Ligand binder design. Sequence first.
Ligand SMILES: CCC(O)(CC)COc1ccc([Si](C)(C)c2ccc(OC[C@@H](O)CCC(=O)O)c(C)c2C)c(C)c1C
Lengths: 11, 240
Amino acid sequence: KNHPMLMNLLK
Amino acid sequence: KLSEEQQHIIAILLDAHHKTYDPTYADFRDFRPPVRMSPLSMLPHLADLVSYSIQKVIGFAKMIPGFRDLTSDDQIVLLKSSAIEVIMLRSNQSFTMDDMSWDCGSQDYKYDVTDVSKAGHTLELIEPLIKFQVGLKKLNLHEEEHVLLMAICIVSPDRPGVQDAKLVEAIQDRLSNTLQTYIRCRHPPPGSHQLYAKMIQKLADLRSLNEEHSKQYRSLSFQPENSMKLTPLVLEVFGN
Ligand SMILES: CCC(O)(CC)COc1ccc([Si](C)(C)c2ccc(OC[C@@H](O)CCC(=O)O)c(C)c2C)c(C)c1C
């Protein structure tokens, strides 16, 4: 489970 | 009693809420259209609505004091487990006890139990959800208490997969003492009676609503034709 969209919105 | 740091915490959270909750609901026109007039006719619209709200929850969480001192993995675990619960909490602002519906500014964006069923969900979730909304609304929370509860909900140390639970607990504890002290100093009786304990009870209610929604979401999203109607963010956060 990679969460690139969540991670990007957290950046 | 309400220290400078605690007043600062409350100011940040109020601002974060104001920056992530639009009470005009102007963006709803960007969503796929509601269909009401059996098929899950409301799933495209409500998938977009949920996905929109997940983005708002993330924007709110980022402004919680101490939240970005956590690791990326811990931030992700906390938002993945709490997003559904904060959406339920945030939705109380539009809930009206007049007809037990969520009123988002206009008839097309006014949601009742039938709309939620038309996204695939059953009374197993919907009945306790309405009971939750009624009991939360009856608390008549100050906005200060409302945004503290959303933040305490997000920074919970017992979420599955959390790594630095000691740091998550320290951040939550700072928020819990802020809320406990706010109620004791700024919420007049009789509304303040057992208010903190009632608010924590609502966090326990949210865990049960979380469990049931996750159960039904897994059932709905397991069917590819339903998953096709979801958004990429919903699939990433709620599951795939
Ligand atoms: C897609 C996954 C699903 O499981 C199908 C697979 C469906 O799930 C659903 C479907 C519908 C709902 Si509802 C009770 C109609 C809801 C949701 C979000 C809201 O928030 C908007 C707010 O954010 C606007 C303010 C701002 O941000 O500017 C509000 C206000 C309401 C009433 C819920 C809660 C879930 C979980």
